[PDB]
C-alpha cells in the first residue's frame, strides 16, 4: 500500500526480485538449466595509457596568465585542418571538386570501426 516510494528489485515477491535490477549493463546470456554464458567481448575493456614520464598534473599553477574562452566549431576546424591543404593545392592544378576525399572527407560511415552517426563507441 505504498505508491510514493521508488519501485526497486527489493520490493516484489520471489519472481519479481529476480527480474528487475539496478542499472548494470548485461554481459552475456542464459541457456538451459540457467547456465550463464559470459561473452568476453560484451565486457567493456579499459583502454588505459602509460603514465611514465608525464609532466601534466591534476592541478594548475596560479602563475599562469588568463585567456579568453573560445569554443570549437566546424568552421574553424575546417580552417586549421583542411583549408591550408586545399588552398596549397589550388595554387597548382592538383585540386579537384571530385575526389576531395584526399583531404579527409568520407562519403559514408558504414565501413568505419568508429562511426560518427549513429555513434557506435563508448565515450
Amino acid at each position: 500500500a505504498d505508491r510514493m516510494s521508488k519501485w526497486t528489485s527489493k520490493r516484489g515477491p520471489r519472481s519479481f526480485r529476480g527480474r528487475k535490477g539496478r542499472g548494470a549493463k548485461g554481459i552475456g546470456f542464459l541457456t538451459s538449466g540457467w547456465r550463464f554464458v559470459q561473452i568476453k567481448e560484451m565486457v567493456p575493456e579499459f583502454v588505459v595509457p602509460d603514465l611514465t614520464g608525464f609532466k601534466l598534473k591534476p592541478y594548475v599553477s596560479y602563475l599562469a596568465p588568463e585567456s579568453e574562452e573560445t569554443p570549437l566549431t566546424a568552421a574553424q576546424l575546417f580552417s586549421e585542418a583542411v583549408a591550408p591543404a586545399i588552398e596549397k593545392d589550388f595554387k597548382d592544378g592538383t585540386f579537384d571538386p571530385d575526389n576531395l576525399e584526399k583531404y579527409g572527407f568520407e562519403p559514408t560511415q558504414e565501413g568505419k570501426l568508429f562511426q560518427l552517426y549513429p555513434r557506435n563507441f563508448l565515450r
Binding site: 500500500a1 505508491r3 510514493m4 520490493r11 516484489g12 515477491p13 519479481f16
Partner: protein
C-alpha cells in the same frame, strides 16, 4: 470481524492498478490524463 479486507500482494496490486493496466483501455488512458491535469504525483501504482 471485519476491517482486514486488504490482504496485500505486489503481483495483484500491479496487475490490477498498474501503468500497463491503465493504458490497456481508452477509459484508463483518461484516468491517467485526469491525474496529470490535477497534478498528482502518483499517476498509478
Amino acid at each position: 470481524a471485519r476491517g482486514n479486507e486488504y490482504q496485500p500482494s505486489n503481483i495483484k496490486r500491479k496487475n490490477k492498478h498498474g501503468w500497463v493496466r491503465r493504458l490497456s483501455t481508452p477509459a484508463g488512458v483518461q484516468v491517467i490524463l485526469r491525474r496529470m491535469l490535477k497534478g498528482r504525483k502518483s499517476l498509478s501504482h
